[PDB]
Design a binder for this molecule. Structure first.
Ligand code: A1LV5
Ligand code: A1LV5
Ligand code: ATP
Length: 519
């Protein structure tokens, strides 16, 4: 039987339109999902939306709509975007669905019953322009009155903050500290990249985990605490349980949950790694549930000297990139340009360079040159592979095998840009092999027809390798390449067909009417 593999993106907050930042996470998850499917895993890939809170309530009111009206529109547009990116997600979780709300309610009541949660008062300091609450120790220019902080400025914006006090339920998370830290020791690959771990534990665990305010009373757009409905469940419990509620946890059919939980990987950017590495495992401990195997926190797409953000408006719309440059281009750029773990700036120039030089030129010209030569020299009939007949073949065939091996290692460690660059070294090599072998010279001599056929056979096999390896990344080009080469055997499109070079040992009629693979 097939081993399960369960991967998630964060549930995104639809307070504005999604941008290439969000597409980065979602395409990255899709690449992993598609890769794991090709490796023979039974895959489930989840994404969704985080729909509660005062900000959504405010956005809806400003737009003259109810919350659910506003959300249904925003989510329709998000679902359109994923369809347009050809995301292979098996489900889409909305926190407004009853299947989700039921879990949030039951989890909260269970924690109340166990004594994990107790009633108190939340105190904080709100900044309007930051839309952020701060603790008193975070405030700049604290103003004192009889030894007590009665005011200050936000450390981000410098704006005057306002005191907030409201009845709130608190989650005792500190009692799980030793268990959490033991989990980290036993599972060294849990936090990825491991460079994230030190800072996170130094700043957030070392000083002591404060009791966590897990409800609010000052607004009503949220999952209501059944036994105390003036309280709504705040972000921590509401958003985090999506990963299990989507699987029918605590429903009448827990089969998806029993099959796929625990998650093999939660994907996210670095600004929410602490919530998925501290609060999330602790919540799962309170429920006596298995912990996720890995949390990967990638870096940020940057622009205008800062993180791309729908609040700041420093954004690039993925819909515009797809319409202007095509789908493969967009997906390729996202996975290739920014190494998975580091930060990087978006520029239009880097986008066009990356996509024209690598896709249309290196790969596109390779396929065009190859097919046109087969058409010219053999009237479309590609001679069957025989062996490494040319003096360069043994080493190039060895490169094909090493390309696969290296790619695999890069893919397993989630270094997508490296996997891609490795594929492209082989693509570039294959173009060079045309220059080195000069097939047009071989075509003049009738005695050289066998060698010419061998050169053609090696070009197509190299192309086939590249096309297979690109299937997780590019959804259009590999299929197009297979069609134009007229490789119909579905087995020759799978990873296992890359074990031994030279699978095409019957002649094939390539396309008589080739066209550019891109855009
Ligand atoms: N910096 C943060 N501090 C905590 C306050 C968050 C309030 N702002 C939100 N944008 N809330 C939301 N995404 N959701 C939300 C859900 C329910 C309710 Cl009642 C209110 C808000 N959080 C954050 N930026 N995002 C976040 C995302 C996922 C998780 Cl698991 C945790 C935090
Ligand atoms: N960078 C560090 N990495 C984490 C060390 C490995 C965690 N494993 C445990 N088996 N920790 C423990 N039971 N507790 C623990 C407590 C004190 C110390 Cl000296 C070490 C571990 N930590 C650090 N520099 N200080 C630290 C201090 C207090 C706490 Cl609660 C957590 C971390
Ligand atoms: N600039 C970015 N680079 C990489 N990933 C991003 C970026 N922006 C968003 N994401 C993805 O979406 C998740 C949530 O980000 P979020 O929507 O809060 O960013 P935002 O657009 O700045 O929103 P807000 O303006 O409300 O902070 C991240 O954890 C990540 O998976």
């Amino acid at each position: 039987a097939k081993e399960t593999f369960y991967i998630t993106t964060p549930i995104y907050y639809p307070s504005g339109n999604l941008h290439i930042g969000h597409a980065y996470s979602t395409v990255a998850g899709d690449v992993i999902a598609r890769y794991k499917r090709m490796q023979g895993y039974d895959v489930r890939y989840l994404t969704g939306t985080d729909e509660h809170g005062q900000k959504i309530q405010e956005k809806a009111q400003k737009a003259g709509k109810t919350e659910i009206e506003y959300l249904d529109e925003m989510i329709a547009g998000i679902k359109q975007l994923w369809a347009k990116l050809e995301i292979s997600n098996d489900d889409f979780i909305r926190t407004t669905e009853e299947r989700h709300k039921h879990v949030v309610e039951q989890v909260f009541e269970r924690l109340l019953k166990q004594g994990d949660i107790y009633l108190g008062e939340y105190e904080g300091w709100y900044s309007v322009p930051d839309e952020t609450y701060y603790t008193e120790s975070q405030l700049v220019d604290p103003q004192y009155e009889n030894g007590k902080i009665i005011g200050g400025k936000s450390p981000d914006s410098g704006h005057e903050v306002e005191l907030v006090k409201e009845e709130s339920y608190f989650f005792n998370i500190s009692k799980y500290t030793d268990r959490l830290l033991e989990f980290y020791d036993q599972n060294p690959d849990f936090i990825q990249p491991p460079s994230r771990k030190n800072e996170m534990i130094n700043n957030f665990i070392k000083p002591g985990l404060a009791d966590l305010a897990v409800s609010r009373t000052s607004f009503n757009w949220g999952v209501h605490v059944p036994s105390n409905p003036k309280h709504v469940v705040y972000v921590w419990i509401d958003a985090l349980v999506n990963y299990i509620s989507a699987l029918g946890y605590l429903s009448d059919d827990e089969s998806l949950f029993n099959k796929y939980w625990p998650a093999d990987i939660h994907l996210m950017a670095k600004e929410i790694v602490r919530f998925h590495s501290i609060i999330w495992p602790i919540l799962l401990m309170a429920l006596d549930l298995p912990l996720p195997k890995k949390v990967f926190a990638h870096g940020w797409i940057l622009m205008k000297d800062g993180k791309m953000s729908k609040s700041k408006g420093n954004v690039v719309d993925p819909n515009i990139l797809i319409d202007r440059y095509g789908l493969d281009a967009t997906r390729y750029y996202l996975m290739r340009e920014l190494p998975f773990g580091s930060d990087g700036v978006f520029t239009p120039e880097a986008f066009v360079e990356r996509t024209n030089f690598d896709l249309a030129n290196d790969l596109g010209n390779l396929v065009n040159r190859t097919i046109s030569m087969v058409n010219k020299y053999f009237d479309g009939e590609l001679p069957a592979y025989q062996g490494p007949l040319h003096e360069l073949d043994e080493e190039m065939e060895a490169m094909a095998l090493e390309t696969v091996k290296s790619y695999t290692e890069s893919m397993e460690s989630l270094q997508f840009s490296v996997a891609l660059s490795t594929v492209w070294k082989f693509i570039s090599r294959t173009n060079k092999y045309i220059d080195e072998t000069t097939p047009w010279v071989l075509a003049k001599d009738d005695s050289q027809k066998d060698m010419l056929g061998n050169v053609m056979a090696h070009l197509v096999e190299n192309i086939r390798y590249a096309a297979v390896l690109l299937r997780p990344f590019l959804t259009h080009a590999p299929k197009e390449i297979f069609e134009q080469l007229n490789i119909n055997n579905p087995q020759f499109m799978e990873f296992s067909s890359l074990e031994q070079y030279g699978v095409l040992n019957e002649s094939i009629m390539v396309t008589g009417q080739p066209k550019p693979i891109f855009p």
